[PDB]
Amino acid sequence: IAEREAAASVPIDIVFGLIHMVLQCGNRRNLYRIIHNISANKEVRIFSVETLVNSIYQAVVEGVIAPEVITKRGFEALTYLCTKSSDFTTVFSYNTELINKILQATNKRTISESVKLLSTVGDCFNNDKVAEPENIEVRKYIGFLEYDMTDDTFKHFCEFIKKTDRFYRPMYLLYLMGGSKKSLEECLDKKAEFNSHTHHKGIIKLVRMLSLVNIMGITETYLDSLMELREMPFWEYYFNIILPKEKESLYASSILPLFKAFVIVHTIQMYIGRNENINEFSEIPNSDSSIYYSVVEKEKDLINTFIQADPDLLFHAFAGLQKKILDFDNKRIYFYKKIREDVQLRPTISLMVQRGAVFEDTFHQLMRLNGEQVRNAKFNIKFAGEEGVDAGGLTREWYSELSKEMFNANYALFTPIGSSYQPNHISHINPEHLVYFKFIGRIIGKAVYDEMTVDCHFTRAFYKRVLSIPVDLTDVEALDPEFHRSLVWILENDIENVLDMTFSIEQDRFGITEIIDLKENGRNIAVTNENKREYVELVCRFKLVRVIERQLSAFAEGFFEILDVDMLKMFNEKELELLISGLPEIDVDDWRNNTIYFGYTSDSQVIRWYWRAVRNFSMEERAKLLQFATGTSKLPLEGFAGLRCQNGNQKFQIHKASGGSSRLPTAHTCFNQLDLPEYDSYEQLVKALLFSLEE
C-alpha cells in the first residue's frame, strides 16, 4: 500500500518501445507483470504512467490498432497497474493534470471504465494531498452524471464524492440543485403523460443524484434553494392523480424511485465542515409548510404493500420514513434483519440435557457463561438416552421442554391465566427463584435472536413492563373485575366530594395491614379530582406489579442482556406478544364457524360486516385482533373449538355493546367477550377494529 524504492536497472528510452509493443500485442497480463516489475522505482513509474496517459490522450483527441480498442486496453492496463500497491495514485496527486486529461478523454464508452479508474484514483486524496484542487475541473466530472451508468458505477461515484466532498462541496451542490430542478421540470412538463416505466432512466438518474445529495448534505448558503425545492406541487399532483393510476397500471418497482425521491427531498441533513478526520458533523433541518405527512397517510396501505414487495427498501431506499407509517409486519421484518446484521462472533457449544429436568440443567449450563457468550452461543443440544434426530430437532425439543418447564406446576414460576401466563404471587415464588426469572429473560431473548417462535404466552402487563410501558387498567380487569369496575367508577364520576379515602391502599398481610404509601408522604395525601387519574394508575401498578415486580425486573436484565434495548423499545405490548410467542396463522372461517353471538345472529348485517373485516384483515392486523379480543396470541391445535378464557373453557362470544356508532369496541379478556356495538357503515367498522387492535 506504500511506495517501494528500487535501483535504476532500466533506461527511459526503451520504455517507450515497450509500451508501444504492448499496445500492438495481446495477452498483456504477462506484460502487466513486466511493466509492474520495471516500474519498481519512482522515476520510471512516473514516466511510464505519464507516457501511457499521453498515448491514451492522443488515441482519442487526435487519433495498426484501432483507437477504441487501443484506448480501452490502455484503460485496462491502467486499472491493473494502479490496483496493486496503491502507489500509482500518489503520482496522480503529485500532478493532478492527468486527472484532467482523463476527464477530458472520457466519451460515452470511456465512462464504464473511467469510473473504475477514478474510484481507485480517489485513494490519492486519502492523505489529503492535492495542492491545487481549484485546477481539477470537477465541473466536467459532475457533468458526466448525465451519462449512462450502472449500479457499480454509481457506487464508485458515491465513493469518489465522499472522498472529494471536503474538496468540492459548493459547486457540487450547485450543479446538483441545477440538475434536480431541470429533471423535475422535465417531469412536470410531461406529468400529464408521465410514465414511470417509459421515462425510467430519467427518474433513475434523478433519484440517484438526490441520494447523492443526501449522502452529501447541504450547506446553509444553498439551504434557501433546498427549502424552495422542498415545495414542489409535482409531488402533490402525482400522488393525488397519477399514483392511483400507476398502482394498478404499472408495476411497483418502477414506481418506487418517486417515493424514494420524496423521502430524499425531506431527508437531507445539514453539513457544516469536516471537523474530524472521517466524522462529518450532520445536523437536521426544519420545515413549516410541507404536507409530506398528508401524502404518506393518503396512500399508506399501498406503500406498505410495496415495502412488503421488497424489504431491502427500508435499509437503503426508505430509511428516512417514520416508524408510524410502517406496519408491524414490515417493521418486524426490518427489526429482525437489523438485529441480525450484528452477527458478531458466535461460538458453538455442545450442551447436555436430561429428560427428567431440562430446566435446571439448562440454567446451570447457561449461567456459567456470560450474556455475550450465551447470546452468541450456537447451542449443540444432545438429549441423553434417545439419539435419533438431528441437531435442529434436538434444539427444538430443548426449546419446547424449556417452555413447558418454565410454566411447570412443580417449578410454579408462572401461574397460568389460561392461554397466557403470569408469575405467581410473592408468597408462592421463593426469594431464591429470582435467578430463574433472569433465566427466562435470557431464554426468550435468545429465542427471539434465534428467530424461534416459542410458546411463552404472558399477560399484557408483563409485556408492558418489559417494554417499559406503564400497566393499563385492562390487565387488572383481566384478573379482578370488581376492582376494575370500582376504579372506573371512581375515575369517571366527580367522587372527590364523598371520596373519603387517602392516597395509600390497604393490602392485608394476615397478621396486620401496613400503610403502604404510593408516593412520597402518601398517607397524608387524600385523593382529589386533579390526581384521580394518578391515583387510579398508581393503584393499578401497585395492586398487581408490586407482587410481580422483581420477576419482571429479573426478566428485564435477562432479556436485555441478549438483545439491544434501543431497537426493542420501539414496539408495542401487543406487538411484543407476536414477537415473543410468535406470529400464529389464524383462520377466519374457523373463527366465525365456532363463535357464538349474543343479541345478534349469524346472518346479522353488522355481524357479517365484522366477519368480512376479519376476512380481509392482514396477518399483522388479524393477529392483533385475535390478541385484543381473546387476550392472547395462543391458538389451540383444534382452532377455536378448544379456545379457553381465564375462567375455564369458553368459545368466542360476541355481545351487543348497546352503544353508538362512534363508540369503540371493547374486549374483556376474562370471558373472551367482545362488545360489538351498532355501526352505520362497513368502513367505519373496519377503522374502529383497526384502532382497537392497534391501541
Tab-separated table of N, CA and C in Angstrom, residues 508-595:
chain	number	residue	atom	x	y	z
A	508	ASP	N	-53.987	-6.599	52.930
A	508	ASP	CA	-53.819	-7.371	54.153
A	508	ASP	C	-52.686	-8.381	54.026
A	509	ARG	N	-51.884	-8.481	55.085
A	509	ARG	CA	-50.814	-9.465	55.212
A	509	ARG	C	-51.096	-10.402	56.377
A	510	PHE	N	-52.353	-10.837	56.502
A	510	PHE	CA	-52.796	-11.753	57.551
A	510	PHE	C	-52.651	-11.137	58.938
A	511	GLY	N	-51.411	-10.985	59.405
A	511	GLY	CA	-51.197	-10.507	60.764
A	511	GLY	C	-51.691	-9.088	60.980
A	512	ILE	N	-51.362	-8.185	60.057
A	512	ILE	CA	-51.725	-6.779	60.189
A	512	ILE	C	-51.671	-6.145	58.808
A	513	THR	N	-52.402	-5.046	58.638
A	513	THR	CA	-52.390	-4.288	57.395
A	513	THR	C	-51.499	-3.064	57.572
A	514	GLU	N	-50.443	-2.979	56.767
A	514	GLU	CA	-49.479	-1.891	56.851
A	514	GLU	C	-49.854	-0.795	55.862
A	515	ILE	N	-49.530	0.448	56.210
A	515	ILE	CA	-49.846	1.588	55.355
A	515	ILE	C	-48.722	1.746	54.335
A	516	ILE	N	-48.955	1.273	53.114
A	516	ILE	CA	-48.002	1.406	52.021
A	516	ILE	C	-48.310	2.699	51.282
A	517	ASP	N	-47.452	3.699	51.455
A	517	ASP	CA	-47.621	4.965	50.758
A	517	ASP	C	-47.222	4.803	49.298
A	518	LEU	N	-48.128	5.180	48.394
A	518	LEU	CA	-47.876	5.003	46.970
A	518	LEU	C	-46.844	5.987	46.436
A	519	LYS	N	-46.493	7.007	47.211
A	519	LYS	CA	-45.526	8.011	46.791
A	519	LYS	C	-44.937	8.655	48.039
A	520	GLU	N	-44.232	9.768	47.848
A	520	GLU	CA	-43.658	10.497	48.971
A	520	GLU	C	-44.775	11.121	49.801
A	521	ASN	N	-44.771	10.839	51.105
A	521	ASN	CA	-45.807	11.315	52.024
A	521	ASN	C	-47.197	10.891	51.552
A	522	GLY	N	-47.312	9.627	51.136
A	522	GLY	CA	-48.551	9.129	50.562
A	522	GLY	C	-49.719	9.074	51.524
A	523	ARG	N	-49.482	8.668	52.774
A	523	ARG	CA	-50.583	8.514	53.722
A	523	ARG	C	-51.283	9.842	53.987
A	524	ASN	N	-50.514	10.918	54.149
A	524	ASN	CA	-51.086	12.229	54.433
A	524	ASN	C	-51.840	12.825	53.251
A	525	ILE	N	-51.713	12.246	52.062
A	525	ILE	CA	-52.351	12.777	50.864
A	525	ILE	C	-53.680	12.068	50.646
A	526	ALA	N	-54.734	12.847	50.436
A	526	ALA	CA	-56.023	12.311	50.033
A	526	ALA	C	-56.168	12.386	48.516
A	527	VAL	N	-57.164	11.675	48.000
A	527	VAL	CA	-57.410	11.616	46.564
A	527	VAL	C	-58.332	12.763	46.173
A	528	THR	N	-57.929	13.526	45.158
A	528	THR	CA	-58.675	14.684	44.687
A	528	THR	C	-58.977	14.525	43.200
A	529	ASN	N	-59.737	15.483	42.662
A	529	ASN	CA	-60.124	15.426	41.254
A	529	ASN	C	-58.914	15.547	40.335
A	530	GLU	N	-57.968	16.424	40.678
A	530	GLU	CA	-56.801	16.626	39.823
A	530	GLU	C	-55.936	15.375	39.734
A	531	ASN	N	-55.782	14.647	40.838
A	531	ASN	CA	-54.910	13.482	40.890
A	531	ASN	C	-55.674	12.164	40.836
A	532	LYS	N	-56.935	12.178	40.392
A	532	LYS	CA	-57.704	10.938	40.345
A	532	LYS	C	-57.122	9.958	39.329
A	533	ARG	N	-56.681	10.454	38.168
A	533	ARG	CA	-56.035	9.577	37.195
A	533	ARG	C	-54.726	9.022	37.743
A	534	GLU	N	-53.933	9.873	38.398
A	534	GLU	CA	-52.695	9.411	39.015
A	534	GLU	C	-52.977	8.361	40.080
A	535	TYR	N	-53.997	8.592	40.910
A	535	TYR	CA	-54.362	7.621	41.937
A	535	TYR	C	-54.767	6.290	41.315
A	536	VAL	N	-55.616	6.332	40.286
A	536	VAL	CA	-56.103	5.100	39.671
A	536	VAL	C	-54.950	4.320	39.048
A	537	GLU	N	-54.081	5.007	38.300
A	537	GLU	CA	-52.994	4.303	37.627
A	537	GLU	C	-51.956	3.791	38.622
A	538	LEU	N	-51.691	4.548	39.693
A	538	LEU	CA	-50.742	4.087	40.698
A	538	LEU	C	-51.282	2.883	41.456
A	539	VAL	N	-52.580	2.879	41.769
A	539	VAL	CA	-53.173	1.719	42.423
A	539	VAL	C	-53.180	0.521	41.479
A	540	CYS	N	-53.389	0.760	40.180
A	540	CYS	CA	-53.281	-0.321	39.205
A	540	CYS	C	-51.881	-0.919	39.203
A	541	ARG	N	-50.857	-0.064	39.207
A	541	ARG	CA	-49.479	-0.546	39.219
A	541	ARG	C	-49.141	-1.268	40.517
A	542	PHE	N	-49.654	-0.788	41.646
A	542	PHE	CA	-49.258	-1.296	42.951
A	542	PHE	C	-50.152	-2.414	43.467
A	543	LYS	N	-51.229	-2.743	42.758
A	543	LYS	CA	-52.076	-3.861	43.152
A	543	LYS	C	-51.592	-5.178	42.561
A	544	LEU	N	-50.994	-5.137	41.374
A	544	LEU	CA	-50.520	-6.333	40.697
A	544	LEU	C	-49.010	-6.393	40.528
A	545	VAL	N	-48.378	-5.325	40.038
A	545	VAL	CA	-46.947	-5.383	39.755
A	545	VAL	C	-46.141	-5.505	41.043
A	546	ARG	N	-46.590	-4.856	42.122
A	546	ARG	CA	-45.795	-4.817	43.347
A	546	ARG	C	-45.635	-6.178	44.011
A	547	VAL	N	-46.393	-7.189	43.594
A	547	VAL	CA	-46.113	-8.570	43.965
A	547	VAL	C	-45.461	-9.341	42.832
A	548	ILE	N	-45.360	-8.743	41.644
A	548	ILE	CA	-44.707	-9.359	40.497
A	548	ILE	C	-43.494	-8.564	40.033
A	549	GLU	N	-43.077	-7.543	40.787
A	549	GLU	CA	-42.137	-6.553	40.270
A	549	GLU	C	-40.755	-7.134	39.990
A	550	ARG	N	-40.228	-7.989	40.870
A	550	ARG	CA	-38.842	-8.410	40.686
A	550	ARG	C	-38.743	-9.598	39.739
A	551	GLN	N	-39.839	-10.338	39.548
A	551	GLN	CA	-39.906	-11.242	38.403
A	551	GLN	C	-39.716	-10.469	37.106
A	552	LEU	N	-40.459	-9.370	36.949
A	552	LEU	CA	-40.322	-8.536	35.760
A	552	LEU	C	-38.930	-7.930	35.666
A	553	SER	N	-38.362	-7.507	36.797
A	553	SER	CA	-37.031	-6.909	36.771
A	553	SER	C	-35.983	-7.916	36.307
A	554	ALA	N	-35.971	-9.104	36.923
A	554	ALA	CA	-35.009	-10.134	36.545
A	554	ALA	C	-35.194	-10.548	35.094
A	555	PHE	N	-36.447	-10.723	34.664
A	555	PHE	CA	-36.706	-10.980	33.256
A	555	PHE	C	-36.184	-9.846	32.389
A	556	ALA	N	-36.210	-8.614	32.900
A	556	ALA	CA	-35.731	-7.476	32.126
A	556	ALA	C	-34.229	-7.556	31.892
A	557	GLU	N	-33.436	-7.778	32.950
A	557	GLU	CA	-31.999	-7.843	32.664
A	557	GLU	C	-31.645	-9.117	31.907
A	558	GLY	N	-32.430	-10.185	32.064
A	558	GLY	CA	-32.194	-11.373	31.258
A	558	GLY	C	-32.476	-11.144	29.785
A	559	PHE	N	-33.561	-10.429	29.482
A	559	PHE	CA	-33.996	-10.216	28.108
A	559	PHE	C	-33.172	-9.137	27.415
A	560	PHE	N	-32.657	-8.167	28.173
A	560	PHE	CA	-31.871	-7.090	27.584
A	560	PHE	C	-30.378	-7.389	27.539
A	561	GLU	N	-29.923	-8.464	28.174
A	561	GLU	CA	-28.546	-8.911	28.015
A	561	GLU	C	-28.388	-9.871	26.846
A	562	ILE	N	-29.460	-10.110	26.092
A	562	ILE	CA	-29.385	-10.863	24.854
A	562	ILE	C	-29.693	-9.997	23.635
A	563	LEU	N	-30.489	-8.940	23.792
A	563	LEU	CA	-30.918	-8.097	22.687
A	563	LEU	C	-30.678	-6.629	23.019
A	564	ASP	N	-30.609	-5.807	21.974
A	564	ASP	CA	-30.388	-4.377	22.150
A	564	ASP	C	-31.671	-3.690	22.605
A	565	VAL	N	-31.552	-2.833	23.620
A	565	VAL	CA	-32.726	-2.190	24.205
A	565	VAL	C	-33.321	-1.163	23.247
A	566	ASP	N	-32.468	-0.408	22.547
A	566	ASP	CA	-32.955	0.691	21.717
A	566	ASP	C	-33.837	0.191	20.581
A	567	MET	N	-33.391	-0.847	19.872
A	567	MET	CA	-34.164	-1.383	18.759
A	567	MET	C	-35.348	-2.219	19.224
A	568	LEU	N	-35.453	-2.478	20.527
A	568	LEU	CA	-36.583	-3.194	21.104
A	568	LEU	C	-37.679	-2.279	21.625
A	569	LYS	N	-37.318	-1.153	22.247
A	569	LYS	CA	-38.303	-0.298	22.903
A	569	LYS	C	-39.281	0.346	21.930
A	570	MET	N	-39.003	0.301	20.629
A	570	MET	CA	-39.842	0.926	19.617
A	570	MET	C	-41.032	0.062	19.199
A	571	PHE	N	-41.398	-0.940	19.993
A	571	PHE	CA	-42.514	-1.820	19.681
A	571	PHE	C	-43.602	-1.706	20.743
A	572	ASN	N	-44.778	-2.227	20.404
A	572	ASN	CA	-45.946	-2.183	21.271
A	572	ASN	C	-46.054	-3.463	22.098
A	573	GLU	N	-46.862	-3.395	23.161
A	573	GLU	CA	-47.055	-4.567	24.011
A	573	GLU	C	-47.829	-5.657	23.278
A	574	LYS	N	-48.789	-5.271	22.435
A	574	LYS	CA	-49.477	-6.252	21.604
A	574	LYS	C	-48.537	-6.827	20.553
A	575	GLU	N	-47.646	-5.993	20.012
A	575	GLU	CA	-46.634	-6.482	19.084
A	575	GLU	C	-45.613	-7.367	19.785
A	576	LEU	N	-45.347	-7.111	21.070
A	576	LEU	CA	-44.396	-7.940	21.804
A	576	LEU	C	-44.894	-9.371	21.949
A	577	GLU	N	-46.212	-9.564	22.031
A	577	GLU	CA	-46.752	-10.917	22.093
A	577	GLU	C	-46.447	-11.687	20.813
A	578	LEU	N	-46.617	-11.041	19.657
A	578	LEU	CA	-46.257	-11.689	18.401
A	578	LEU	C	-44.746	-11.812	18.249
A	579	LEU	N	-43.985	-10.957	18.935
A	579	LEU	CA	-42.530	-11.023	18.849
A	579	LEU	C	-41.977	-12.187	19.663
A	580	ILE	N	-42.586	-12.470	20.812
A	580	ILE	CA	-42.082	-13.491	21.724
A	580	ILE	C	-42.772	-14.818	21.442
A	581	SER	N	-44.100	-14.847	21.582
A	581	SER	CA	-44.860	-16.070	21.376
A	581	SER	C	-44.908	-16.501	19.916
A	582	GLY	N	-44.569	-15.618	18.991
A	582	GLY	CA	-44.604	-15.920	17.576
A	582	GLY	C	-45.816	-15.307	16.894
A	583	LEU	N	-45.834	-15.452	15.569
A	583	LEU	CA	-46.908	-14.936	14.724
A	583	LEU	C	-47.760	-16.103	14.242
A	584	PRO	N	-48.797	-16.491	14.981
A	584	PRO	CA	-49.616	-17.628	14.556
A	584	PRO	C	-50.489	-17.278	13.363
A	585	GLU	N	-50.845	-18.308	12.601
A	585	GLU	CA	-51.749	-18.165	11.462
A	585	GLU	C	-53.150	-18.527	11.939
A	586	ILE	N	-54.034	-17.536	11.985
A	586	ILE	CA	-55.399	-17.754	12.447
A	586	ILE	C	-56.331	-17.837	11.246
A	587	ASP	N	-57.349	-18.687	11.353
A	587	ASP	CA	-58.305	-18.894	10.275
A	587	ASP	C	-59.574	-18.095	10.542
A	588	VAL	N	-59.990	-17.304	9.552
A	588	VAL	CA	-61.227	-16.541	9.679
A	588	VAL	C	-62.435	-17.467	9.637
A	589	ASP	N	-62.398	-18.478	8.765
A	589	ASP	CA	-63.513	-19.414	8.673
A	589	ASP	C	-63.700	-20.175	9.979
A	590	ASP	N	-62.602	-20.647	10.575
A	590	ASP	CA	-62.697	-21.309	11.872
A	590	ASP	C	-63.075	-20.327	12.972
A	591	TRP	N	-62.651	-19.066	12.847
A	591	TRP	CA	-63.032	-18.052	13.824
A	591	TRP	C	-64.539	-17.825	13.827
A	592	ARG	N	-65.151	-17.752	12.644
A	592	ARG	CA	-66.576	-17.458	12.552
A	592	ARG	C	-67.452	-18.695	12.704
A	593	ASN	N	-66.930	-19.885	12.394
A	593	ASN	CA	-67.738	-21.095	12.494
A	593	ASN	C	-68.089	-21.428	13.938
A	594	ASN	N	-67.165	-21.205	14.870
A	594	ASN	CA	-67.359	-21.578	16.266
A	594	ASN	C	-67.298	-20.353	17.168
A	595	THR	N	-67.962	-19.274	16.760
A	595	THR	CA	-68.105	-18.076	17.579
A	595	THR	C	-69.587	-17.840	17.830
